[PDB]
Amino acid sequence: DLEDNWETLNDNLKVIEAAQVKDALTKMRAAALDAQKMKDFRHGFDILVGQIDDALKLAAEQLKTTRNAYIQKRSASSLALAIAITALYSAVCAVGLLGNVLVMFVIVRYTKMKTATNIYIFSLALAGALATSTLPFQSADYLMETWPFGELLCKAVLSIDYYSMFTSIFTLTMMCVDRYIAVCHPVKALDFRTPAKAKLINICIWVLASGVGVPIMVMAVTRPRDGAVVCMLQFPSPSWYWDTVTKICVFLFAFVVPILIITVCYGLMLLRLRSVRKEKDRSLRRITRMVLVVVVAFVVCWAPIHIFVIVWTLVDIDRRDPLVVAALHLCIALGYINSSLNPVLYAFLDKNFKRCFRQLC
Amino acid sequence: TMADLEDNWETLNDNLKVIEKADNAAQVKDALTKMRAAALDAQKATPPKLEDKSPDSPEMKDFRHGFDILVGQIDDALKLANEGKVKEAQAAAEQLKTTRNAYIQKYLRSASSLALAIAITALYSAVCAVGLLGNVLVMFVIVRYTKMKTATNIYIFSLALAGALATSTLPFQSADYLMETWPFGELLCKAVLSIDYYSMFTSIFTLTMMCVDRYIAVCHPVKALDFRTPAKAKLINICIWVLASGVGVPIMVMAVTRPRDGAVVCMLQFPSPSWYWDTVTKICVFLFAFVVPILIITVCYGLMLLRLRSVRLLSGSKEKDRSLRRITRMVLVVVVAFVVCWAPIHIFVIVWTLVDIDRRDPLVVAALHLCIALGYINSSLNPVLYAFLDKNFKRCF
Amino acid sequence: YXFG
Amino acid sequence: YXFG
Ligand SMILES: CC(C)CCC[C@@H](C)[C@H]1CC[C@H]2[C@@H]3CC=C4C[C@@H](O)CC[C@]4(C)[C@H]3CC[C@]12C
Numbered sequence: 001d002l003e004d005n006w007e008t009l010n011d012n013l014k015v016i017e018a019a020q021v022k023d024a025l026t027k028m029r030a031a032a033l034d035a036q037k038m039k040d041f042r043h044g045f046d047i048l049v050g051q052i053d054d055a056l057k058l059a060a061e062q063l064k065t066t067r068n069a070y071i072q073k074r075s076a077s078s079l080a081l082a083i084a085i086t087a088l089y090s091a092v093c094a095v096g097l098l099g100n101v102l103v104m105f106v107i108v109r110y111t112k113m114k115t116a117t118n119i120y121i122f123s124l125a126l127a128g129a130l131a132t133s134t135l136p137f138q139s140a141d142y143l144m145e146t147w148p149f150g151e152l153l154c155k156a157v158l159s160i161d162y163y164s165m166f167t168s169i170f171t172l173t174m175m176c177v178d179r180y181i182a183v184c185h186p187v188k189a190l191d192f193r194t195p196a197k198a199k200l201i202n203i204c205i206w207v208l209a210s211g212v213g214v215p216i217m218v219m220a221v222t223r224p225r226d227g228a229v230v231c232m233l234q235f236p237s238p239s240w241y242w243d244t245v246t247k248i249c250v251f252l253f254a255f256v257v258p259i260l261i262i263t264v265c266y267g268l269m270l271l272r273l274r275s276v277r278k279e280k281d282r283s284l285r286r287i288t289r290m291v292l293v294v295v296v297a298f299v300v301c302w303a304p305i306h307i308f309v310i311v312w313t314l315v316d317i318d319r320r321d322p323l324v325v326a327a328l329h330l331c332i333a334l335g336y337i338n339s340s341l342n343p344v345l346y347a348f349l350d351k352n353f354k355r356c357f358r359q360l361c
Numbered sequence: 362t363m364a365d366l367e368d369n370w371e372t373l374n375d376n377l378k379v380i381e382k383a384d385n386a387a388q389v390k391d392a393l394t395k396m397r398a399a400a401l402d403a404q405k406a407t408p409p410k411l412e413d414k415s416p417d418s419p420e421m422k423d424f425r426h427g428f429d430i431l432v433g434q435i436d437d438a439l440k441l442a443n444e445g446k447v448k449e450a451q452a453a454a455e456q457l458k459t460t461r462n463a464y465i466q467k468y469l470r471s472a473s474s475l476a477l478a479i480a481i482t483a484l485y486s487a488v489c490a491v492g493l494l495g496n497v498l499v500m501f502v503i504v505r506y507t508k509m510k511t512a513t514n515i516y517i518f519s520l521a522l523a524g525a526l527a528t529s530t531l532p533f534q535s536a537d538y539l540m541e542t543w544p545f546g547e548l549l550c551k552a553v554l555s556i557d558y559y560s561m562f563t564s565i566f567t568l569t570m571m572c573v574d575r576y577i578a579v580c581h582p583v584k585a586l587d588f589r590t591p592a593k594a595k596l597i598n599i600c601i602w603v604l605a606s607g608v609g610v611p612i613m614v615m616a617v618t619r620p621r622d623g624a625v626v627c628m629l630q631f632p633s634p635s636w637y638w639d640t641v642t643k644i645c646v647f648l649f650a651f652v653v654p655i656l657i658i659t660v661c662y663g664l665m666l667l668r669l670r671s672v673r674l675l676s677g678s679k680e681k682d683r684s685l686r687r688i689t690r691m692v693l694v695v696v697v698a699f700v701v702c703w704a705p706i707h708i709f710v711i712v713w714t715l716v717d718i719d720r721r722d723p724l725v726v727a728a729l730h731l732c733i734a735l736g737y738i739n740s741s742l743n744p745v746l747y748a749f750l751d752k753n754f755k756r757c758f
Numbered sequence: 759y760x761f762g
Numbered sequence: 763y764x765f766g
């Protein structure tokens with residue numbers, strides 16, 4: 001048994017720490033030979049046998065460093081990690097779905113979408129509820145190491161994931177633009193920030209994003225790799241080319257462009273405030289402060305997965321390595337934190353449920 | 362108290378909006394009457410900011426002076442409401458907003474408890490999703506694939522059934538915390554509380570017996586071929602689930618919804634004197650579900666280390682004797698996890714009963730819900746960790 | 759266990 | 763974004 005051989009290798013490394021160390025080293029080799037008895041795992045035991053041979057001649061703890069070429073391919077340590085990730089995806093999914101549905105409910109039932117600001121919040125909440133709805137599937141796939149929901153559901157997951165990423169990010173960018181207009185051009189804001197114009201802008205975002213959603217829905221396929229099934233985009237030939245174009249276009253239009261716009265928005269709202277010369281004067285100072293919170297949270301939550309996507313395409317990453325896997329799904333969830341549990345959605349609930357959460361320090 | 366200070370401060374602010382949206386003198390009059398009584402009540406309190414300050418300190422005299430100006434202005438607005446004026450009395454309420462802003466506000470600064478409520482919701486949802494769906498999956502793999510033809514498979518099913526029942530309460534418990542009320546009714550209150558106490562005992566007593574079963578396997582391997590029979594394991598688990606109804610049923614009888622401060626409370630209605638029987642229940646739960654299980658499991662461990670210390674002392678062959686040493690190290694793992702998960706809440710219930718705790722303080726709220734949650738983490742993680750580390754189960758999944 |  |  002491979003599990004029994006794995007234990008006898010470890011339970012014997014502690015017997016060492018002259019004749020006793022030699023009898024332990026030979027006992028380790030016979031287990032290591034039966035442990036080798038997919039080709040990458042077999043290579044690990046060849047380095048292990050070879051190092052044991054040098055120790056039998058004499059290396060002391062060098063076998064523990066070579067053991068890191070067979071452990072990923074500890075026992076409970078892997079299970080603890082899979083649980084932690086399942087817990088992270090389920091916390092992000094459950095707070096995401098319920099937070100966004102609740103915001104939408106507050107707007108539909110109580111607020112009644114009269115202001116332009118509430119239209120930009122409804123759209124951002126709708127985008128967040130769609131974004132978090134793919135998580136049960138993404139976390140099941142991680143756990144099972146295979147796509148068990150078929151092609152049609154793979155198309156639905158990949159298309160909704162790409163589509164909702166852009167509708168969320170652009171609704172957020174446009175909100176900051178809308179608020180920038182209020183702070184800096186108030187005479188012009190009276191004619192622009194009307195609910196009919198907020199309705200049109202938001203609808204344009206949802207219809208425009210279908211230029212991403214539809215090609216992603218077309219390319220999304222279920223293909224078999226190493227006996228298991230994978231949900232993936234099938235780019236036209238050359239796939240490596242169109243894959244690189246897609247990654248560069250997502251990083252440019254859904255990350256750098258929104259930051260640049262929100263940052264230019266922040267700085268201009270800032271100059272407008274500096275150009276001033278009591279309560280109505282500092283009421284605009286809260287709005288500009290909110291824009292800064294938005295951009296900081298955007299950079300914080302989205303930069304790690306973008307730096308990871310770039311590192312992954314450029315450098316050969318050990319997909320098996322435990323800490324690599326931990327960092328990947330943290331980065332993925334951290335992207336979803338902005339998408340669905342956004343600082344604007346927080347502020348909105350903090351305003352409408354003020355009395356429920358207000359308490360003296 | 363600071364609860365009185367917060368509630369009075371709230372009453373002052375709430376009654377300002379009453380005048381703001383008032384249409385008659387009767388509405389403006391009583392709002393100022395409440396506001397006047399709450400201003401005189403609040404000036405008696407000491408702000409948290411100035412808790413370290415003397416009742417006659419210049420800051421404390423300034424806090425009180427703010428209320429003197431407020432009460433004076435409230436009485437000016439009262440005479441206008443009494444005279445028959447509703448425009449002037451409403452206009453005088455605006456100058457009351459400038460007074461509590463320029464004088465009192467600095468001493469009574471507030472913060473939002475929204476980020477704590479989100480974290481709490483996140484904690485219950487994560488412990489629920491992993492716990493419920495995880496144990497439902499464990500139960501499915503045992504029933505449909507790793508058919509319960511062994512003693513172990515019957516015990517993993519019992520821990521799994523209990524773990525799943527335990528975590529099914531969490532959506533109701535966290536909705537109650539958010540809403541600051543029980544919106545599900547008395548029947549769902551009975552189902553929740555009974556399942557809560559019941560599944561606690563079935564979970565802990567099936568876990569305890571697993572350690573006894575491991576002890577028999579390790580220390581008496583020849584005699585275990587008779588005892589560790591699936592029909593004998595089946596019987597033990599049924600006895601636990603039937604025995605545990607002496608807790609589930611009385612909790613179901615006593616579980617009631619009662620009105621308190623305009624909100625609804627899901628609670629246990631204990632017989633006369635209710636405070637006594639409530640304290641007795643907390644003592645019996647601590648002794649049977651915490652102390653008794655720790656003792657039995659620690660004794661199972663101590664005996665296992667002794668029975669393996671003798672084989673070590675025999676010095677025959679440690680080539681396969683070490684395969685049982687991993688099972689006893691796992692018993693130490695189970696006992697430490699049970700202590701670390703259950704000890705904080707059990708100590709919390711003992712302190713809650715003997716000492717007055719600030720129910721409002723966000724530190725006590727954060728710590729309380731973390732404490733409640735750890736108990737669920739244990740009840741739902743013991744079956745999944747055992748099953749996903751079981752050789753037979755791993756192949757069948 | 760703790761509710762409420 | 764990142765799956766798979
Ligand atoms: C098993 C070990 C590792 C855990 C220790 C238990 C800790 C986390 C728990 C057990 C009892 C708890 C305390 C019970 C009562 C009070 C009084 C209250 O006004 C403030 C919180 C405070 C002070 C709690 C803080 C956290 C506490 C100390």
Ligand SMILES: CCCCCCCC/C=C\CCCCCCCC(=O)O
Binds near residue numbers: 535
């Ligand atoms: C995996 C299960 C997820 C757990 C989610 C728990 C359900 C949350 C339930 C209700 C939230 C209602 C929001 C109302 C908050 C405002 C306060 C109030 O109404 O008094």
Ligand SMILES: CCCCCCCC/C=C\CCCCCCCC(=O)O
Binds near residue numbers: 509515518519595
């Ligand atoms: C309110 C919920 C109460 C549910 C009571 C459940 C009682 C059954 C408890 C444990 C089952 C243990 C497994 C033993 C059955 C073996 C399967 C079989 O062969 O029939």
